[PDB]
Amino acid sequence: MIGLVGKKVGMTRIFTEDGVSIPVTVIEVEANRVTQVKDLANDGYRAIQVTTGAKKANRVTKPEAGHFAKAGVEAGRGLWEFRLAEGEEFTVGQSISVELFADVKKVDVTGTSKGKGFAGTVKRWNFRTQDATHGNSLSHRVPGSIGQNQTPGKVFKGKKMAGQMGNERVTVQSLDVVRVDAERNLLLVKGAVPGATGSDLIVKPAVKA
Amino acid sequence: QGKALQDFVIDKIDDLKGQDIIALDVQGKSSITDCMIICTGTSSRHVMSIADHVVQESRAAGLLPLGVEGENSADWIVVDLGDVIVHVMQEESRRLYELEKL
Amino acid sequence: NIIKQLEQEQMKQDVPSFRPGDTVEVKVWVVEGSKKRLQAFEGVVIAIRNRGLHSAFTVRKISNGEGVERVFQTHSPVVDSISVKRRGAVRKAKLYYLRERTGKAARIKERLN
Amino acid sequence: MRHRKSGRQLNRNSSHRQAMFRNMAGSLVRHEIIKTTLPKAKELRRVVEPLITLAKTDSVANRRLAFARTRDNEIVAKLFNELGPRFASRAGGYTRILKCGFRAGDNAPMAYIELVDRSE
Amino acid sequence: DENLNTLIDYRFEKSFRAERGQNGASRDCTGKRGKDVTIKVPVGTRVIDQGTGETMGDMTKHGQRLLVAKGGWHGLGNTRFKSSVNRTPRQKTNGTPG
Amino acid sequence: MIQEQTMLNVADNSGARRVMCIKVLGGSHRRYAGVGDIIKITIKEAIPRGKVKKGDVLKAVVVRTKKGVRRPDGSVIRFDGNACVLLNNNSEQPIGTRIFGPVTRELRSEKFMKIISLAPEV
RNA sequence: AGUGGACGCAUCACUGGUGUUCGGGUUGUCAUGCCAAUGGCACUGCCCGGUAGCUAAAUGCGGAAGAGAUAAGUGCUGAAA
RNA sequence: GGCUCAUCACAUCCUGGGGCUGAAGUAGGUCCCAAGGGUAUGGCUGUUCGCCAUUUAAAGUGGUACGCGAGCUGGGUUUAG
RNA sequence: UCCUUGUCGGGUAAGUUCCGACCUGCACGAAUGGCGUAAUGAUGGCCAGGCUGUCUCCACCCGAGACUCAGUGAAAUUGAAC
RNA sequence: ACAGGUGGUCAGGUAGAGAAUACCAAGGCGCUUGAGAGAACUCGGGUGAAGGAACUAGGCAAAAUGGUGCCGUAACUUCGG
């Protein structure tokens, strides 16, 4: 089925009567009004475009403003689409709430994780950190060897070495769902999800069994 | 429920020649076990059968044993039922350990 | 906002207040099979970390000549009753110095109030 | 990794930083005019404004704690006597940033941080 | 062998050679010890030799290993023979056969 | 967290007093032994009249760890001094008769009911 | 069906580590006129802690289950004969 | 030579599928297909190799001018004592 | 001292290192000195107690560079290069 | 206008045995490029959960003890140590 769109708010753990601690992630997913419905005849694939939240009218770009006007919905922070899965059909302007995830009980959450800047090789691919003593000079955490001798003479692209990590799309799969609240606009999921506090993210039913 | 299972285990072990039966009460002394029953085994074959006997009546009584220890050695072996724990021991091997000091 | 409201609904409102260095008696539940007992635990608190519903404190006792340190969560159902026996008199929030000194030479006096 | 961190060090150690704003807070109060580069003035609000709101009430202990900063009897005497009553009805924002181009030495961003009125 | 009673594994395979100890290599690389092949035998097999036709030991219990043919002795390379009397270590010492 | 090349204390009347763990068990590249595991050790100090003679290598079970265990409710049980209880080589039955000091309750799921039956403290 | 070893992603809510912009104890000395109270220097003067943030040893998850065409192989019908 | 970083081939160490088996079951022996993944820590000497202790299912074999010093060390090789 | 990792014992789980014992002295040998020697040594080797980021295994923090801006402004090398 | 070398003369207070050391008096300076960013990485350091040399050729580097007063102090020995 389709997913929902929320954002990280904080971390807390829920207590059971049996005395088991379940650390959950607080996700706030409100009424995700559908902005556009796509069909095979007109678009080649069946999907619906959805938005959430409210955006200040000054920053609402005028071409964007007309887009929501056609759908009959107010402004949003973004326009993500969730694909349809052969048998559930929706209409433009329909609002979907937390109650859709009342039975999935397993979700995969994806989003833009925290950016680490220009992180080193050790922080990126967890290298083995050449010895810092026993005569070692000016090379304590450098990558070291990156290639072979006069043979071919190139480093194969895809090599693991220094670069920028984080601030990229990443998915964590099969997260246990603990509690769903529609009246209080809450989504509690066992574990941790990518992104920081307030970063936008999308949650979908788990594709695994 | 402890007294009912205590009667259920003491009767079954005695049905297959289980001698030197003493029921201990460690309530208050220790916070792990509720009741302590001790048993004597002459040698390896039948004490394993006693362990085989008690584990299969437990499966037929609903309560699932949560741990056993005796493997490739019959000097000691334990079968657990939660509140009540049975210790079937060899007579020669018991004297090395304690008797009614637990 | 939503975090704080979620914190307060699961909060425990019957936890007594104890000082960092008092002698505290705590009874902790045990989940074993189908029947549960209460475990009485002796010791003196050496550290207090009061942080929301996840507030925790560390208690230390001596058993068979060996020191064991136990931690708890104040707002958890695992603990049942936290009672203070004698009130300590120390000006340090963190009593991490008890490890180096021996027990017999590190008795804490009463607060007298 | 400077995530959710506040306060700069300006390529200067902690010993310099405390002494740096020690003079900066005192000089701003004594004269009520300053021509310093923006990063000084931008980070200047960390110290002087808490000092001014420390002068909202007059007490012996309050002045002693205020004396621990600004390292000067003359500066603290200026507080609690005129900075207090003048800013009594104002809650915060005792300083204003006024960028004034670049210096001729090394082209650093010049800025003014000043009191609202200065009573001058 | 307690978990078997078969003896056909002796007519199907009658000749076996323990691997010869590999010759020493350059860079002062010694030869790896030939892996000891274990011949499983059912309990109660008394062994006779051509020559000293006396049993080295009867097989009664399960889980014990008996040695019937000890391995040879490794050879000595020219590096071990380094000296100034010859000033040219080139002689070779072959290993004693098992 | 106890790895190779470390000396521990002894929590039974076997005879050893200062033992040094010989190799961590559990799998390939096992960095750390937990609190419920089969850790094998060697003897560095023992009473001459005891059952074990100093220098022997034999299995053991760790009972107390300085870091502690992880309770399912975010709790740890810290100790003062790592301790172990000896084992036979072929069989995992400890040889000692008494156990000194408290023992964590997480070892119930570890299937080492020798220590649980003994050690009356906790 | 569970529980583990190695690797990867997320994470600060739990256990901690750091946390020289936070508080406190203390030595020598100088200074603020002095008592008291404070500031500088001596590696942050030496230490005890610990906000946020970062992080692991801390906790959640991942490898799939499947589908199509296949190697070795096992087959049905089946003539060439 | 060690540390770091790896790449490819299959004459496959394990995992995977089968034939024969002298395959009662388990544990195995040989061969075929299969490179997707993984494919030890220590004491001794500079040692690669190797003797031993001890783990894992495994501690595979090779090529890459027997990889990699404008990456690191110089313990062997080392002019001058 | 080629056979020397000579053979055995101690030390460690494991010791081509170290110490003790056995002499089969290729090529020990008595002022180009032999045998012991307290103390002494920035002398070679080995072992033990404490200690620790040497390492398992890396994380954070403080300063000087590295990066941006402004001013001054270098060198090896270079047949020609799309 | 160089982190180098260069002989003599005078030698304050505090605590300290001291011309060591930490601060200060008179005096002399802030060392002729700075303002920002708070990445990898390089250099000098601080601290660290559990382990305590398991790394390495080698305890290399680090880390550790360190003063005063009392008691006590081994084999050997040239009687001094």
From Swiss-Prot, chain A:
Q: Does the keyword Chaperone apply?
A: no
> InterPro entries in the record, alphabetically?
Ribosomal_uL3, Ribosomal_uL3_bac/org-type, Ribosomal_uL3_CS, Transl_B-barrel_sf
Query: Positions modified as N5-methylglutamine?
Result: 150
Keyword match RNA-binding:
yes
From the record, what ranges are coiled-coil? none
Tell me how the protein is altered or processed after translation.
Answer: Methylated by PrmB.
An example GO biological process term is: cytoplasmic translation
Question: Which GO molecular-function terms appear in the entry?
Answer: rRNA binding; structural constituent of ribosome
Instruction: Name the PROSITE patterns for this protein.
Output: RIBOSOMAL_L3
May I have one GO cellular component term? cytosol
- Pfam families in the cross-refs: Ribosomal_L3
Q: Tell me the SUPFAM superfamilies matching this sequence.
A: Translation proteins (SSF50447)
Read off the PANTHER family from this record. 50S RIBOSOMAL PROTEIN L3 (PTHR11229), LARGE RIBOSOMAL SUBUNIT PROTEIN UL3C (PTHR11229:SF16)
Q: How does it assemble?
A: Part of the 50S ribosomal subunit. Forms a cluster with proteins L14 and L19. In pull-down experiments interacts with CedA.
Provide the family line: Belongs to the universal ribosomal protein uL3 family.
NCBIfam families the record matches: L3_bact
Role summary: One of two assembly initiator proteins, it binds directly near the 3'-end of the 23S rRNA, where it nucleates assembly of the 50S subunit.
- What this protein is called in its record is Large ribosomal subunit protein uL3
Q: Which gene encodes it?
A: rplC
Curated annotation (Swiss-Prot), chain C:
| Inducing or repressing factors | Part of the rpsP-rimM-trmD-rplS operon.
The highest taxon in the source lineage is Bacteria
- The question of whether Iron-sulfur is a record keyword is answered with no
Q: Does the keyword Lipid biosynthesis apply?
A: no
Q: Which GO terms describe its molecular function?
A: large ribosomal subunit rRNA binding; structural constituent of ribosome
- Please provide one cellular component term from the Gene Ontology annotations of this protein: cytoplasm
Q: Biological process GO annotation list?
A: cytoplasmic translation; ribosomal large subunit assembly
SUPFAM superfamilies, per the entry = Translation proteins SH3-like domain
User: Which residue ranges run through the membrane?
Assistant: none
What Gene3D superfamilies has UniProt attached to this entry?
2.30.30.790
Q: What are the UniProt keywords, alphabetically?
A: Ribonucleoprotein, Ribosomal protein, RNA-binding, rRNA-binding
Q: How does it assemble?
A: Part of the 50S ribosomal subunit. Contacts L14. Forms two bridges to the 30S subunit in the 70S ribosome, contacting the 16S rRNA. In pre-50S ribosomal subunits interacts with RsfS, which may inhibit association with the 30S subunit.
User: Family, per the entry?
Assistant: Belongs to the bacterial ribosomal protein bL19 family.
Function statement: This protein is located at the 30S-50S ribosomal subunit interface and may play a role in the structure and function of the aminoacyl-tRNA binding site. In the 70S ribosome it has been modeled to make two contacts with the 16S rRNA of the 30S subunit forming part of bridges B6 and B8. In the 3.5 A resolved structures L14 and L19 interact and together make contact with the 16S rRNA. The protein conformation is quite different between the 50S and 70S structures, which may be necessary for translocation.
**Protein name, entry field:** Large ribosomal subunit protein bL19
Origin species: Escherichia coli (strain K12)
UniProtKB/Swiss-Prot annotation, chain D:
Keyword flag Membrane: no
Q: Which domain of life is it from?
A: Bacteria
- Which molecular-function annotation in GO is an example for this chain? structural constituent of ribosome
Q: Any idea which UniProt keywords this protein has?
A: Ribonucleoprotein, Ribosomal protein
Would you tell me the Gene Ontology cellular component terms? cytoplasm; cytosol; cytosolic large ribosomal subunit
Q: Which GO terms describe its biological process?
A: cytoplasmic translation; ribosomal large subunit assembly
Q: Which family does it belong to?
A: Belongs to the bacterial ribosomal protein bL17 family.
Tell me how this protein assembles: Part of the 50S ribosomal subunit. Contacts protein L32.
Function, as annotated, reads: Requires L15 for assembly into the 50S subunit.
Write the protein's name. Large ribosomal subunit protein bL17
Q: Which gene encodes it?
A: rplQ
UniProtKB/Swiss-Prot annotation, chain E:
Q: Where is the Obg domain?
A: 1-98
Keyword Metal-binding on entry = yes
Q: What is the effect of changing residue 31 to E?
A: Temperature-sensitive for growth at 42 degrees Celsius, defects in chromosome partitioning
Q: Which UniProt keywords apply?
A: Cytoplasm, DNA-binding, GTP-binding, Hydrolase, Magnesium, Metal-binding, Nucleotide-binding, Ribosome biogenesis, RNA-binding, rRNA-binding
Gene inactivation phenotype reads: Essential for growth, it cannot be disrupted.
Say yes or no: keyword Iron present. no
Q: Where is the composition biased (Polar residues)?
A: 80-96
Protein's cellular compartments = Cytoplasm
Q: Which GO terms describe its cellular component?
A: cytosol
> A GO BP term, please?
ribosomal large subunit assembly
GO MF term list: DNA binding; GDP binding; GTP binding; GTPase activity; guanosine tetraphosphate binding; guanyl ribonucleotide binding; magnesium ion binding; ribosomal large subunit binding
Induction details: Constitutively expressed, levels decrease toward stationary phase (at protein level). Induced in a dose-dependent manner by UV irradiation.
| Segments for region (Disordered) | 78-98
Quick one: where is this thing mainly located?
cytoplasm
**The record's note on its domains:** The C-terminus (residues 341-390) is not required for either 50S ribosome subunit association nor 70S ribosome dissociation.
State the protein's purpose.
An essential GTPase which binds GTP, GDP and possibly (p)ppGpp with moderate affinity, with high nucleotide exchange rates and a fairly low GTP hydrolysis rate. Plays a role in control of the cell cycle, stress response, ribosome biogenesis and in those bacteria that undergo differentiation, in morphogenesis control.
Q: Which family does it belong to?
A: Belongs to the TRAFAC class OBG-HflX-like GTPase superfamily. OBG GTPase family.
Q: What protein name applies here?
A: GTPase ObgE/CgtA
Instruction: Please give the organism.
Output: Escherichia coli (strain K12)
Full protein segment contained here: 50 to 147 of 390
